[PDB]
Design a protein around this ligand. Structure first.
Ligand code: TUA
Lengths: 221, 211
């Protein structure tokens, strides 16, 4: 029923500006006070802005300092946040929220839209196959992997055999390395099935519109 | 201003235990709220107005407190209760920093595997040696890299998964990144996991001059 759907987030250079929107459905949008809440990379949650149902009453969080402007259009059931002179510390997931009563709990949250403030540019990943090689295993199981290196911004999505190998998969959280992201993914299969049955990792990076497949092949020793 | 602190930052418990976590305010306030968050999804209203349960919240949960101290309590905890719980109140800018509740289970040693740099990566002039430590418990585990018999500590990056939603284990990767020339100057590469399940480590290794 009730839906809150954010948009407008992305990559922006320091000093830049951005406008976030939140599309509402399933309730009488103009009867409700609304807010923006952001979650920083450290998972810290900060109340950014609040707007009364009529749009005539407004508050902002402590570190905003006039660089944010909350507004709404009750006719189009949309909430906005205009952000300017953006700083590294404004990098966060921005959530649209709805208020229940006048002790101001937030009873519905949107899916969030991600804002990243830095000078780094969109960069596709390099993908490398991880075969045991000179570390050949000997069990009834074998573990293989893919190394995804050097992309920006997050995220990438990794699958194995187009999603048909889903159990036995661990995709690890990405880390910054030379200010670009790197992660690895492992898959474990019965050792009788490889290499007789092909194993392929599928890597998608939406921001760069890149998609690559890397077959895991035994190394030529 | 008024600020919130939460205790403890992280706790773990077996299903069936009683759980209590606290939220403290620097000065007296009222009508405290609590939000539940799980990885990859948005915060969710869980308790509001200090003690009202939100829709869909089991009666095992209760909130209480007054003044400068508040608490959320769970009776006979269940695996689905695992999450981060954040307190917040109508005059507070920054939510409490959250208590992360984790699931206790039986100890498990990791399955360890090591991978040499691929030829494709070497072609580009880098060399990552990757070690996976999969399906272990508890989260605390020590990884040590030895190159040609001597401990190596620079250029290692480690990354843990979130607790596994089906079996409650943890997995982690340890990656040693070198230049191709640094990698080509040495021969024996070892990844060692030391975990409380055994006093003797689990060791995987390879020689570069093979294969
Ligand atoms: C309940 C409150 C006060 C009275 C009111 O009519 C509506 C609200 C909702 C927005 C709250 C606000 C104040 O308490 C101050 C808050 C917390 C603001 C959100 C950011 C805020 O401006 C702030 O962070 C100041 O520290």
């Amino acid at each position: 029923e009730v839906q809150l759907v954010e948009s407008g987030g992305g990559l922006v250079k320091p000093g830049g500006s951005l406008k976030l929107s939140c599309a509402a459905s399933g309730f009488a949008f103009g009867n409700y006070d609304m807010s923006w809440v952001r979650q920083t990379p450290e998972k810290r949650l900060e109340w950014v802005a609040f707007i009364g149902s009529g749009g005539g009453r407004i508050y902002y969080g402590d570190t905003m300092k006039g660089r944010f402007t909350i507004s709404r259009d009750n006719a189009k059931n949309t909430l906005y946040l205009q952000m300017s002179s953006l700083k590294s510390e404004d990098t966060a997931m921005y959530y649209c929220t709805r208020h229940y009563n006048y002790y101001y709990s937030m009873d519905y949250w949107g899916q969030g839209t991600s804002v990243i403030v830095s000078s780094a540019k969109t960069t596709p990943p390099s993908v490398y196959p991880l075969a045991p090689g000179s570390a050949a295993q000997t069990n009834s199981m074998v573990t293989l992997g893919c190394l995804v290196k050097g992309y920006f911004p997050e995220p990438v999505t990794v699958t194995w055999n187009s999603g048909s190998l889903s159990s036995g998969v661990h995709t690890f959280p990405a880390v910054l390395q030379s200010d670009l992201y790197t992660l690895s993914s492992s898959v474990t299969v019965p050792s009788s099935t490889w290499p007789s049955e092909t194993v392929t990792c599928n890597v998608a990076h939406p921001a760069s519109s890149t998609k690559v497949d890397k077959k895991i092949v035994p190394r030529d020793c | 201003d008024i600020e919130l602190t939460q205790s403890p930052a992280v706790m773990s418990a077996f299903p069936g235990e009683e759980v209590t976590m606290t939220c403290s305010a620097s000065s007296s306030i009222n009508y405290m709220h609590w939000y539940q968050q799980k990885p990859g999804t948005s915060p969710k209203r869980w308790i509001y107005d200090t003690s009202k349960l939100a829709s869909g919240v089991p009666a095992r949960f209760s909130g209480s407190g007054s003044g400068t101290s508040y608490s959320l309590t769970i009776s006979s905890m269940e695996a689905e209760d695992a999450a981060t719980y954040y307190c917040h109140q109508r005059s507070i800018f920054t939510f409490g920093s959250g208590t992360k509740l984790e699931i206790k289970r039986a100890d498990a040693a990791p399955t360890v595997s090591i991978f040499p740099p691929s030829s494709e990566q070497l072609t580009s002039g880098g060399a990552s040696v990757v070690c996976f430590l999969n399906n272990f418990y508890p989260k605390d585990i020590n990884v040590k890299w030895k190159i040609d018999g001597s401990e190596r500590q620079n250029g290692v990056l480690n990354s843990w998964t979130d607790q596994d939603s089906k079996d409650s284990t943890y997995s982690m990767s340890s990656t040693l990144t070198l230049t191709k020339d640094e990698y080509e100057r040495h021969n024996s590469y070892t990844c060692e996991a030391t975990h409380k399940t055994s006093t003797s480590p689990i060791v995987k290794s390879f020689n570069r001059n093979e294969c």
